[PDB]
Design a binder for this molecule. Structure first.
Ligand code: LO7
Ligand code: KNA
Length: 257
């Protein structure tokens, strides 16, 4: 029944709004001058970077990098709260639950990162600030190319014009992979994902009826996520070797194995 699929979609959207304080709908209202929300202080160089705490509640590159790192640990926390709400996920073997998160968590971070980006920069501090792509790329090596592959993806991805009710099901599909390395019981995972994929497919054609093959173009985007993740991992191993004094969160170290 299509009707059970819509109920699942409604359930996941509601759980996505409850788990993530900054939705794409809010992010786009901030980014584009809407009166439902307020304007971000823009950071484009070092003076505005230090002017930035005068509005938004060590060297500059390592400080920015370690805040982006604190934020990621926070998103991991929000993603795990979302994941538990995906029907059947808490019912799986605990070891497989850990494996799905470990491998799914960064692909979801960069999907939702895209909600907070345009070609020019990225919202920070829950929408209160905006950090210019040009500033980030001007950071000293090896940090200037830290964010550029996320912007390249985001610009391509934001072109699909997905909204939060689409994204809620898509990030569920990402978690419930079943081709993840080290999974004990693949088949229960594949059964949950086949359901999510049916819910996503219906959602896309009801919400985007004039968008030809949007289901397939979005599933292809999963290729770009995998490559962002693997590049970021390699870049981190270079930062850790040249910056032996920069501390990495154990939660992120446990995932990066
Ligand atoms: C590289 C892409 C990116 C993503 C998110 C952020 C953020 O920074 C947004 O969320 C925030 C904002 C501000 C801080 C302050 C940090 S935190 C600390 O430990 N000392 C500080 O100055 C922490 C987190 N930046 C960059
Ligand atoms: C985004 C510019 C403000 C820098 C520090 C913001 C507060 C730090 C935090 O929330 O962890």
């Amino acid at each position: 029944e299509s009707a059970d699929l819509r109920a699942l979609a409604k359930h996941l959207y509601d759980s996505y709004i409850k788990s993530f304080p900054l939705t794409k709908a809010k992010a786009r209202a901030i980014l584009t001058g809407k009166t439902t929300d307020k304007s971000p202080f823009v950071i484009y160089d070092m003076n505005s970077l230090m002017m930035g705490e005068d509005k938004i509640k060590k060297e500059v590159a390592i400080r920015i990098f370690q805040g982006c790192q604190f934020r990621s640990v926070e998103a991991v926390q929000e993603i795990t709260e979302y994941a538990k709400s995906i029907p059947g996920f808490v019912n799986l073997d605990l070891n497989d639950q850990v494996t799905l998160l470990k491998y799914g968590v960064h692909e979801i971070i960069y999907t939702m990162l895209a909600s907070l980006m345009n070609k020019d920069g990225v919202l920070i501090s829950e929408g209160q600030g905006f950090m210019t792509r040009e500033f980030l790329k001007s950071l000293r090596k090896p940090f200037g190319d830290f964010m550029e592959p996320k912007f390249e993806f985001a610009v391509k991805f934001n072109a699909l014009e997905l909204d939060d009710s689409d994204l809620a099901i898509f990030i569920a599909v990402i978690i419930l992979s079943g081709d993840r390395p080290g999974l004990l019981n693949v088949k229960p995972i594949e059964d949950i994902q086949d359901n999510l994929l049916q819910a996503l497919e219906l959602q896309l054609k009801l919400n985007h009826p004039e968008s030809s093959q949007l289901f397939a173009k979005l599933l292809q985007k999963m290729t770009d996520l995998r490559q962002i993740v693997t590049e970021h991992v390699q870049l981190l191993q270079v930062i850790k070797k040249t910056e032996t004094d920069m501390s990495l969160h154990p939660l992120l170290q446990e995932i990066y194995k």
